[PDB]
Amino acid sequence: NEIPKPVAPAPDILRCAYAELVVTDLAKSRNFYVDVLGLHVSYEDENQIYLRSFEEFIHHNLVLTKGPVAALKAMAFRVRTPEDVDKAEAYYQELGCRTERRKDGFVKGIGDALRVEDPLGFPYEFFFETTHVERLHMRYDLYSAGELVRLDHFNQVTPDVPRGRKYLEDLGFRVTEDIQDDEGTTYAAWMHRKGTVEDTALTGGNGPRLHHVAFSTHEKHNIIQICDKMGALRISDRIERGPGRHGVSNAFYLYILDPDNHRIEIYTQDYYTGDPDNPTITWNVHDNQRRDWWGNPVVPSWYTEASKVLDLDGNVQEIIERTDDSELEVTIGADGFSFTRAGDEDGSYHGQASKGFKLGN
Amino acid sequence: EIPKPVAPAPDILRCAYAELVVTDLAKSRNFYVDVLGLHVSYEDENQIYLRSFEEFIHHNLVLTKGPVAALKAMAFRVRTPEDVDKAEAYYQELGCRTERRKDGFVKGIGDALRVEDPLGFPYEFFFETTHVERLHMRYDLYSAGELVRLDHFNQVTPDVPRGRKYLEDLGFRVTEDIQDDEGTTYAAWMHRKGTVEDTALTGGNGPRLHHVAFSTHEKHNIIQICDKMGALRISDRIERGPGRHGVSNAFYLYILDPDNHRIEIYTQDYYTGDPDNPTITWNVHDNQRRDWWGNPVVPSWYTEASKVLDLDGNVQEIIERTDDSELEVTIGADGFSFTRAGDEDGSYHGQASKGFKLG
Amino acid sequence: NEIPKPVAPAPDILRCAYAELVVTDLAKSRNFYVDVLGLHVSYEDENQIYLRSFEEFIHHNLVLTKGPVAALKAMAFRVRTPEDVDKAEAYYQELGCRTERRKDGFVKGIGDALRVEDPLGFPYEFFFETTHVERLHMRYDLYSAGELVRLDHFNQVTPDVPRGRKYLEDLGFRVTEDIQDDEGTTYAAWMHRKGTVEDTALTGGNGPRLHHVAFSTHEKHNIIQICDKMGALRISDRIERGPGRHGVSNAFYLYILDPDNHRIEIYTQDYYTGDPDNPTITWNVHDNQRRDWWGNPVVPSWYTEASKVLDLDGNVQEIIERTDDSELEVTIGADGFSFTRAGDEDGSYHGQASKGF
Amino acid sequence: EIPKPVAPAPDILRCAYAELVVTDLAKSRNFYVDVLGLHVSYEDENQIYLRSFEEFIHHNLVLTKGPVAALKAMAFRVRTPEDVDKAEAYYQELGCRTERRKDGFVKGIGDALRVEDPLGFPYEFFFETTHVERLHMRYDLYSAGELVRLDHFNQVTPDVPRGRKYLEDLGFRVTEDIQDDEGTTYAAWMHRKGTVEDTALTGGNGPRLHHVAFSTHEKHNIIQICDKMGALRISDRIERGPGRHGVSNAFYLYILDPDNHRIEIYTQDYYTGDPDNPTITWNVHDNQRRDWWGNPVVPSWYTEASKVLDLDGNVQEIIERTDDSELEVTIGADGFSFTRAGDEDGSYHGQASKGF
Numbered sequence A: 001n002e003i004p005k006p007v008a009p010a011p012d013i014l015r016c017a018y019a020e021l022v023v024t025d026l027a028k029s030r031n032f033y034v035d036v037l038g039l040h041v042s043y044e045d046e047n048q049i050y051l052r053s054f055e056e057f058i059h060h061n062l063v064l065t066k067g068p069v070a071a072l073k074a075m076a077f078r079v080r081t082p083e084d085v086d087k088a089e090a091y092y093q094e095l096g097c098r099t100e101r102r103k104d105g106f107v108k109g110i111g112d113a114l115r116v117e118d119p120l121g122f123p124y125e126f127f128f129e130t131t132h133v134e135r136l137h138m139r140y141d142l143y144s145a146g147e148l149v150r151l152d153h154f155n156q157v158t159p160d161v162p163r164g165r166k167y168l169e170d171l172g173f174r175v176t177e178d179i180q181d182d183e184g185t186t187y188a189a190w191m192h193r194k195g196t197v198e199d200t201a202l203t204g205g206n207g208p209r210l211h212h213v214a215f216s217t218h219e220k221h222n223i224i225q226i227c228d229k230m231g232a233l234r235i236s237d238r239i240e241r242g243p244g245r246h247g248v249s250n251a252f253y254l255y256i257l258d259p260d261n262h263r264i265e266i267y268t269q270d271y272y273t274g275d276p277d278n279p280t281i282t283w284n285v286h287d288n289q290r291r292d293w294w295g296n297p298v299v300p301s302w303y304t305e306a307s308k309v310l311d312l313d314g315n316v317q318e319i320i321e322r323t324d325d326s327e328l329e330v331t332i333g334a335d336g337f338s339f340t341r342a343g344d345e346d347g348s349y350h351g352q353a354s355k356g357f358k359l360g361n
Numbered sequence B: 001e002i003p004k005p006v007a008p009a010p011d012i013l014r015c016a017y018a019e020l021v022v023t024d025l026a027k028s029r030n031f032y033v034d035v036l037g038l039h040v041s042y043e044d045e046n047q048i049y050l051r052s053f054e055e056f057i058h059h060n061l062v063l064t065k066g067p068v069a070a071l072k073a074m075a076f077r078v079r080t081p082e083d084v085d086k087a088e089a090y091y092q093e094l095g096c097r098t099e100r101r102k103d104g105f106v107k108g109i110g111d112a113l114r115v116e117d118p119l120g121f122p123y124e125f126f127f128e129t130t131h132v133e134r135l136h137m138r139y140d141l142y143s144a145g146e147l148v149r150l151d152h153f154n155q156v157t158p159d160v161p162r163g164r165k166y167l168e169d170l171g172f173r174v175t176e177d178i179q180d181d182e183g184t185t186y187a188a189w190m191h192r193k194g195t196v197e198d199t200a201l202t203g204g205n206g207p208r209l210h211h212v213a214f215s216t217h218e219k220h221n222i223i224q225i226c227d228k229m230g231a232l233r234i235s236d237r238i239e240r241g242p243g244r245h246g247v248s249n250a251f252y253l254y255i256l257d258p259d260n261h262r263i264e265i266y267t268q269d270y271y272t273g274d275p276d277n278p279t280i281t282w283n284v285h286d287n288q289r290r291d292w293w294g295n296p297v298v299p300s301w302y303t304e305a306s307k308v309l310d311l312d313g314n315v316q317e318i319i320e321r322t323d324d325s326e327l328e329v330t331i332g333a334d335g336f337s338f339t340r341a342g343d344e345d346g347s348y349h350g351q352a353s354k355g356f357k358l359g
Numbered sequence C: 001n002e003i004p005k006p007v008a009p010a011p012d013i014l015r016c017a018y019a020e021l022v023v024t025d026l027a028k029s030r031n032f033y034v035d036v037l038g039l040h041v042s043y044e045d046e047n048q049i050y051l052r053s054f055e056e057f058i059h060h061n062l063v064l065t066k067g068p069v070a071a072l073k074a075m076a077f078r079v080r081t082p083e084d085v086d087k088a089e090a091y092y093q094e095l096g097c098r099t100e101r102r103k104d105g106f107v108k109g110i111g112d113a114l115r116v117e118d119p120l121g122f123p124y125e126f127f128f129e130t131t132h133v134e135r136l137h138m139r140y141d142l143y144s145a146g147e148l149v150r151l152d153h154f155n156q157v158t159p160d161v162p163r164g165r166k167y168l169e170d171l172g173f174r175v176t177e178d179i180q181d182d183e184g185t186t187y188a189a190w191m192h193r194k195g196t197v198e199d200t201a202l203t204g205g206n207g208p209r210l211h212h213v214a215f216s217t218h219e220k221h222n223i224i225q226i227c228d229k230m231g232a233l234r235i236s237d238r239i240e241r242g243p244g245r246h247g248v249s250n251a252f253y254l255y256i257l258d259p260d261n262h263r264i265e266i267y268t269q270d271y272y273t274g275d276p277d278n279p280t281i282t283w284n285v286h287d288n289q290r291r292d293w294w295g296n297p298v299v300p301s302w303y304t305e306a307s308k309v310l311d312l313d314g315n316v317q318e319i320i321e322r323t324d325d326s327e328l329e330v331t332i333g334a335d336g337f338s339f340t341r342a343g344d345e346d347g348s349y350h351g352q353a354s355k356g357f
Numbered sequence D: 001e002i003p004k005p006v007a008p009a010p011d012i013l014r015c016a017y018a019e020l021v022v023t024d025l026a027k028s029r030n031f032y033v034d035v036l037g038l039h040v041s042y043e044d045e046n047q048i049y050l051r052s053f054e055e056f057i058h059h060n061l062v063l064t065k066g067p068v069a070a071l072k073a074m075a076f077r078v079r080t081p082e083d084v085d086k087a088e089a090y091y092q093e094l095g096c097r098t099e100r101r102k103d104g105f106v107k108g109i110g111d112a113l114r115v116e117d118p119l120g121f122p123y124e125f126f127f128e129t130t131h132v133e134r135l136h137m138r139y140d141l142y143s144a145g146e147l148v149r150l151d152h153f154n155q156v157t158p159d160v161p162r163g164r165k166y167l168e169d170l171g172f173r174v175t176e177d178i179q180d181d182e183g184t185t186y187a188a189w190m191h192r193k194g195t196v197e198d199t200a201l202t203g204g205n206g207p208r209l210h211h212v213a214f215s216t217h218e219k220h221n222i223i224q225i226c227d228k229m230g231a232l233r234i235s236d237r238i239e240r241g242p243g244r245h246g247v248s249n250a251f252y253l254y255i256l257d258p259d260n261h262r263i264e265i266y267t268q269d270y271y272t273g274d275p276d277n278p279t280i281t282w283n284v285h286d287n288q289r290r291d292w293w294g295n296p297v298v299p300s301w302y303t304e305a306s307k308v309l310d311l312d313g314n315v316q317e318i319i320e321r322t323d324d325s326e327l328e329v330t331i332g333a334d335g336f337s338f339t340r341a342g343d344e345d346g347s348y349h350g351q352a353s354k355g356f
């Protein structure tokens, strides 16, 4: 059921800014994000770790908060002015959503902040005020071979992609690419404020769940190094998918799994989307170069597994099942189909994945 | 067992070129020149002679039109003219068929010996070759995917220790191999030129040619070949990869030519030229041995390979492997692999890694 | 003399979009930009070549226009809406600047467009409407080892940097980085709309002149390849400066010279500036890591040479002399000084450039 | 000329390590370990032993505390234990001073011969060495600037042809050199291991050690060294580069340690292992021979180099080059260079390139 456009003006959103993830063992999670991935510690204590990327000047891009149930607690967007936090509150109230306003922040290093249970069941935060820290962008004495330089985007699993898409468009996100079929189904969409392919993205599936948080690197070899290091640490089982070239976004990518199975994407070298008539690219769901441009098969966990999300009380949001067709099922499932060249039987796949693989039992 | 000759082994420098029989010369040319960017040393209606960016000998690859795609010769350069005579005496003592041509079998090679070796493979040994313009600083020509050297061959043969011993007598030194705990050898890598490999043995029905490998300068050059193949909408000819190898530590990719000949693109293995270079043995169930990142080995990699010819140009008969199959013991329905030895977490039973089973 | 802030609202400027460069030999220029640099032809004829980068979808990033005097004819910024072109027109009219509007464009592939002689003497164009073309961002069948992927920025030589900076700020550009000394002089400033370090930048010097136009690559090796190719073509003398790591911007860079001596920068991997309180970085002019972070010396030509610019009638703009201190003189001239570590005599340079020259 | 011994030459595999005397061990450690990321094989209060990422022999660099910074030994590994005996006979026949230590001069080397060679350089030959963990897949340790192998040495010596013929007799093959039309040789590069160089000769006053070179995997690893040096505010210790070489075709950088020992970082030269590997001669006036992009060579690169020690640890006396100077004929007041031979456009007279 369609989400109405409020009369109240949308807040002016700059970018994705940070996620707060609940984690079950804080020391194990620190080992992953600090020792394996090289994120920089802005603050920590016995309950939380606050981490930032190489080029960041706001207080953090990631808060790890200890709790009993691993989940997304908030995805936070920075807004352009303090007054945009008021606009966000009015906007979401008009939408009939539950909201919570804290003048001195939910997490350290953030000031006046609004959290909301959005119409798709996701916990969004909007804030302007944040504690500036040392921007480490020229600290090459600290630079790692796998350095994560920026927070890039979030990706959300939600059952009805068009419903979500219209709501985000009204909030001022522009869709850059999407995946559809010839029968009216949308499987995924990507949308931005900051002028890259994405600040958030919708993946069709049971939800609300958080698919991933993405960080970028400077160069492709930096992503290769993360893989290499995970091999040396004998944690290659935590590399879920990749590395690859995306069709959607044209980025070089890797997906890995934190100790609570929160999925992290490492990403580089997408393209500029800031013009308001930026061409929207629609890929057909059966095109086997859409997700991995080289045609490598998409691991089934990538479609089925995602993180729980919390409501404003800290309880897990109940999952609503997708009734639209499943991307997994129509591409690599038993009645699935994919092609390399449209209309060519050669290099097509019927009821199995590419490259000689089938879905595991 | 293959006996060690009394005659001295030829001093082999390196792998030098392969002659591949191809069925459609123009389609093969499109692949090797237009897609992969190899440099033409000579061509006519019957053959295309190709070299890599840094080569100075006449060629690294000869594509010969013929009725049945196959490997016709894998050629090693020897240190001196006299080493061709040494190769001839050596293989005659082994009781192999040999053929000697004072003026070469292909253009740009002089005095050369071809043999049907004890494993059924057509080896060539030569010294003399026509030098060409070494293109190593021709950055006006350099591709985003530039292939810079010929690196190695890889041969499929049923009995790896038997082949390994024979190659050792020939002066190749084993760098890495893959074994299990009950004494089966699945693969071995061996060199002359001070890299991980000049040729390599993969256990399987043979003789078949598994692949020919070319290097690039950097990892991104390999990524570009993938990217270009997607743009050309030939991603279905990317067989496996890209990845980081366990064995060799090289960054890699496997692609298939129009006759299904497999080409590896490879970079950044390590120096093995010291005589006590430490050998590395990997367990066959170690899921990081082939792809260090644990990505699954596609089953065609284990099953498919090119035919090889005898000196008459007929296809060599295949002999079946009786030792255990790497595919079966790792990714088949009774297969298993681990991430950490002894740890059930990150182990895979009856399927491949990353959530796939065999198609 | 301070440029006043209009009552009229500023246009919403998205980004630098294209430059129109007058060149004297269209074929020689084509050889440089297409054959050497690999830019993509959107359109050409006997008078003009329209070129774009690998990831662009608007008609072009660079127009080469044959003419008698090599010069910048227009530096063009795209605005957010058609109504922003009206805003630009009112804004510059209130500034008392000469303006010209053409509903059907000045160059092919651009629709309704306003050109102005701006208060610093530069020919700015603002436009929204443009013909979309095939975006080549996944055409890896065409991708060059030196591929130029985006237009990034322009850099302008102007005698009074503070005066220009205030005007650009009023127009909506935000200063990301600058170079000053301890005596109240500003030598350079960088400023943006699109959320990178720069869409345009001001270099203190006699002006108006165009210092350079900059294009991006994906990776540092792509810039190295441009140098390697120029060596192979035996045109290494057209490499002016670099490659290097910038202090200001933190980008990896290269400066080369086209056949009419128009300077092109190749640039990669600066940082995100889109937050409105993005911290502004000020360097001291004597800091020998401010321009090349590795302390490589800046050749004098980089400071003294720059392209002519045209007025709306196509005539060369008269050059006004800088009276503020010269960055060349104070760092590498006879009485110049630079340091590696502030306050350390070791690694400092008196009356000469770094690294032995 | 240095006569060829009748005794057989030792079979030399490769350059293996250098022993550098340093004046302040902790400062040197900071440079080679904390800045450059070399891996500790052993240390104590007098010495630090260091290796590159892909090495399995005990070390590639030994830093020894001493009163005067100098090269103490440049060591080549030989193929067999018997090659040490061959090296001893060979240098004895040459009339050179030698010292054999059956248990080595430095830790992790066994039976070793040091010699004061005919050019005044302290060479070591050894086979026996303690194997260590080869770190080539320890990506948990890998630095953004990782030094992966020892590549070569470069020696300053007054008479390049004399040194070249000596090295050829020892089995080194020349790959590239720089000459002029009058017949002067200014520099030569020569190898055993099938790369462009294991050692190289630069014309100048000598014996002095010009540099020791380490390789990286990729060009960005070299860029990272420069960026790191910037961040550490020691950019003044970047001497020359980064660049593409003409000779060798390698991507390069030169930096200076705390005692002004020069280290090259190098990647992506070409294969030279075939015995008829084509030799490349550049003209000294060709401005792309050293830096392919035509960037000027700073005078310090031609004039400055490290002292070397004799076997008593005293500094070797230096012999002045009497052949023409490459500095003088290219960038000095009467020098010149060209971009394109015969073209005055892109030529530099009495001046280096690019405006200096």
Ligand SMILES: O=C(O)Cc1ccc(O)c(O)c1
Residues within 6 Å of the ligand: B154, B197, B213, B245, B246, B247, B248, B250, B264, B266, B289, B290, B291
């Ligand atoms: O299959 C793997 O990944 C192991 C391996 C290593 C080096 C090679 O050259 C090769 O062809 C295969």
Ligand SMILES: O=C(O)Cc1ccc(O)c(O)c1
Residues within 6 Å of the ligand: D154, D197, D213, D245, D246, D247, D248, D250, D264, D266, D289, D290, D291
């Ligand atoms: O000076 C130059 O640039 C030539 C050169 C090539 C290879 C080397 O290893 C070296 O030290 C110097």
Ligand SMILES: [Ca+2]
Residues within 6 Å of the ligand: A181, A182, A183
């Ligand atoms: Ca359908």
Ligand SMILES: [Cl-]
Residues within 6 Å of the ligand: A246, A248, A290, A291, A292
């Ligand atoms: Cl995807």
Ligand SMILES: [Cl-]
Residues within 6 Å of the ligand: C246, C290, C291, C292
């Ligand atoms: Cl600069």
Ligand SMILES: [Fe+2]
Residues within 6 Å of the ligand: A153, A154, A155, A201, A212, A214, A265
């Ligand atoms: Fe993503």
Ligand SMILES: [Fe+2]
Residues within 6 Å of the ligand: B152, B153, B154, B200, B211, B213, B264
């Ligand atoms: Fe291989």
Ligand SMILES: [Fe+2]
Residues within 6 Å of the ligand: C153, C154, C155, C212, C214, C265
């Ligand atoms: Fe610039």
Ligand SMILES: [Fe+2]
Residues within 6 Å of the ligand: D152, D153, D154, D200, D211, D213, D264
């Ligand atoms: Fe060197």
